[PDB]
Amino acid sequence: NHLHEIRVFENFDMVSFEKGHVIVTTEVVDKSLNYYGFAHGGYIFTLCDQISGLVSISTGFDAVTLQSSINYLKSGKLGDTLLIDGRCVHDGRTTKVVDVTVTNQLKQEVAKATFTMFVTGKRK
Amino acid sequence: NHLHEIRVFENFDMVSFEKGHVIVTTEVVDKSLNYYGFAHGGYIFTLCDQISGLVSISTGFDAVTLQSSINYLKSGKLGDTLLIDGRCVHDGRTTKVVDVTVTNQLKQEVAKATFTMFVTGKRK
Ligand SMILES: [Cl-]
Numbered sequence: 001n002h003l004h005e006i007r008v009f010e011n012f013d014m015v016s017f018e019k020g021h022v023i024v025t026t027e028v029v030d031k032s033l034n035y036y037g038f039a040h041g042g043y044i045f046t047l048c049d050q051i052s053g054l055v056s057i058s059t060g061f062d063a064v065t066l067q068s069s070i071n072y073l074k075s076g077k078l079g080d081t082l083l084i085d086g087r088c089v090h091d092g093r094t095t096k097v098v099d100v101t102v103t104n105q106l107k108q109e110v111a112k113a114t115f116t117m118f119v120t121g122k123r124k
Numbered sequence: 125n126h127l128h129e130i131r132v133f134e135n136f137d138m139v140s141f142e143k144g145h146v147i148v149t150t151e152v153v154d155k156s157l158n159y160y161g162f163a164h165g166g167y168i169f170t171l172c173d174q175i176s177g178l179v180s181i182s183t184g185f186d187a188v189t190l191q192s193s194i195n196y197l198k199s200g201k202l203g204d205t206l207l208i209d210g211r212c213v214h215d216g217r218t219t220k221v222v223d224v225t226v227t228n229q230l231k232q233e234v235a236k237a238t239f240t241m242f243v244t245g246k247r248k
Contacts, residue, residue: 002178003148006132006170014127024127034177041189042173046130046166053158054126065165069193 007031008046020088022054028080039076039110048100048113051086055098056117059088063096063117070113080104094119131155132170144212146178152204163200168235172224175210176239179222183215187241194237198228205229218243 010031015023026047034040048070056063076082083103090097095118102111134155139147150171158164172194180187200206207227214221220241226234 002181003133003136003138003174005134006174008130008132008166008170009127010129012127034174036186040170040173041192042132042166042170045169045173045192046164049164049166049169050127057126065196067193067195068165068169069191071191072189 001035004035005031006040006043008043009050017054017058020055020059020091022051022058022086024051024084025081026084028076028078028082030078032076033078037078039080041072044072044076044102044111045070045113047082047084047102048086048111049115051084051100052098052113052115055086055088056096057123059091059096060123061096062120062123064120065115065117068113068115070111072111074104074108074110076104076110082110089114092119129155130164130167132167133174141178141182144179144183144215146175146182146210148175148208150206150208152200152202152206154202156200157202161202163204165196168196168200168226169194169237171206171208171226172210172235172237173239175208175224176222176241179210179212180220180241181247183212183220184247185220186244186247187220188244189239189241191240192237194235196235198232198234200228200234206234216243
């Protein structure tokens with residue numbers, strides 16, 4: 001109803017984990033959805049966000065996210081396989097910037113986000 | 125381990141619901157958390173996003189978010205009571221803009237987000 005539980009990553013498949021580049025798919029399920037029956041904005045954002053943290057790990061660093069921005073282009077629907085592709089855009093000393101695109105099986109872009117992260121330090 | 129389920133709104137309390145202004149609280153629990161034991165940035169954003177949709181309902185409309193921006197200021201921690209306050213800063217015929225702030229019980233800001241919405245229709 002007006003407030004309800006939402007879940008993210010009840011399922012996933014990690015397709016490729018590469019330097020500054022991470023691809024993961026997932027399928028939209030009942031608890032992915034908002035009250036109008038479409039994939040929830042928060043759900044979509046969290047897909048992007050997790051992938052961006054993995055991009056960040058893939059360049060060697062701990063880095064925390066200071067700000068993000070997302071555009072919602074098309075609806076996610078129940079049963080869609082969504083492809084989440086994170087790419088490092090700036091791999092810096094002090095900051096990182098990661099772009100993420102969400103895509104459906106037609107390869108239409110569902111959402112695009114950018115995450116601006118502060119480099120705390122190396123990963124070991 | 126690296127990809128994992130997250131849940132949002134496993135508990136909540138609807139504090140107030142007024143024209144252009146909605147307050148909800150929630151308590152940070154185990155499935156709110158990221159690998160480091162703090163509230164996940166996607167869980168945080170999803171709290172803001174749902175509240176902004178209620179703000180849009182509160183001004184009498186269905187709306188869909190085109191774009192959001194969020195700034196993370198302070199970590200949420202396990203057990204925290206978070207207060208999510210959404211306010212309509214633009215209540216337009218064709219667009220709505222909603223600011224949401226998340227604070228802890230000290231009134232320290234945990235995050236602030238802004239949501240840019242397209243009006244799809246009048247409620248009922
Ligand atoms: Cl529920």
